Write a protein that binds this ligand. Structure first.
Ligand SMILES: CCCn1c(=O)c2[nH]c(-c3ccc(OCC(=O)NCCN)cc3)nc2n(CCC)c1=O
Length: 291
């Protein structure tokens, strides 16, 4: 009952953490910029983790009896909160690039309306993809509970070719390669901006201070994105060994859940990574708590 306790501990932190973030964005209007619109999506997503994803993962770990629809949802719900966080983290990457690359067209393109528009689309695509196994890509009844109910054991109810080719490579590895590819252009150009501002006949520390505050936000966004891959790769890497190499000793359970716990921990780093990186956030929280 240790894994249960640990999973329950993360559930609390994942709620309190991201809920606190959603509150600070509501109170302090200095955080209600188009950028943090996606951050809220990342928060809400990482809230449902400690609200449904984890409660589901703890239930499906022991396995239960239910229809294919009810079983797949409880099995592929985490794939929704994981996919949404991909779009949120991707947008934040693009966004931070737009600000540094084209600061002028930033306010013209990056609008508080298009943001809410893309987010909605991202969520819709997150359910279509994250719940593709529910469309037909499943192992329900492939060569106890009785007719009508299927032993809801994930590895038995959800394919591996999907978790690898479709989910991992295409819906995780590729994005994280675009994201990393984006940050490559960000800091590469950001340091060029500082070099051009190095041959200017005037001080203009305003464009510098603003540039260093745009980079300080693009870097903070890089650390948020970086922690995602750092907390999901282990789980996927494990599934690449089991699939591509049937011979390779199927990963142990004591090491399997660790890659699962690590994936639920990612939902908690975001709140704490704001209170540290962004000085504007920590002061906002500090006020909420006291009062
Ligand atoms: C790309 C990842 C694909 N993928 C998995 O490979 C996976 N594996 C397990 C999984 C779950 C429980 C296990 O043992 C529980 C146990 O006995 N613990 C004892 C601790 N002392 C083993 C494996 N859940 C998984 N899910 C999530 C499905 C909702 C998933 O999406």
């Amino acid at each position: 009952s240790v894994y249960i306790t640990v999973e329950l501990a993360i559930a609390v932190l994942a709620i309190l953490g991201n809920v606190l973030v959603c509150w600070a964005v509501w109170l302090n209007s200095n955080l209600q910029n188009v950028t943090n619109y996606f951050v809220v999506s990342l928060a809400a997503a990482d809230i449902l983790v400690g609200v449904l994803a984890i409660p589901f993962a703890i239930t499906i770990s022991t396995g239960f009896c239910a229809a294919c629809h009810g079983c797949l949802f409880i099995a592929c719900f985490v794939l929704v909160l994981a996919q949404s966080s991909i779009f949120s983290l991707l947008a934040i990457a693009i966004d931070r690039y737009i600000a540094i690359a084209i600061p002028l067209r930033y306010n013209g393109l990056v609008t508080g309306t298009r943001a809410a528009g893309i987010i909605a689309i991202c969520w819709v695509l997150s359910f279509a993809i994250g719940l593709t196994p529910m469309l037909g890509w499943n192992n329900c009844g492939q060569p106890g509970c009785g007719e009508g109910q299927v032993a809801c054991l994930f590895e038995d109810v959800v394919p591996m070719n999907y978790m690898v080719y479709f989910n991992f490579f295409a819906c995780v590895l590729v994005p994280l390669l675009l994201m990393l590819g984006v940050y490559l252009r960000i800091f590469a150009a950001a340091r060029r901006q500082l070099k051009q501002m190095e041959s200017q006949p005037l001080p203009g520390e305003r464009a510098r201070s603003t540039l260093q505050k745009e980079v300080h936000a693009a870097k903070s966004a890089a650390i948020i994105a970086g922690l995602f891959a750092l907390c999901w790769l282990p789980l996927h890497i494990i599934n690449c060994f089991t699939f591509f190499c049937p011979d390779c000793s199927h990963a142990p359970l004591w090491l399997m859940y660790l890659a699962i716990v690590l994936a639920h921990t990612n939902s908690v780093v975001n709140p704490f990574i704001y209170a540290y990186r962004i000085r504007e956030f920590r002061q906002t929280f500090r006020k909420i708590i006291r009062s």
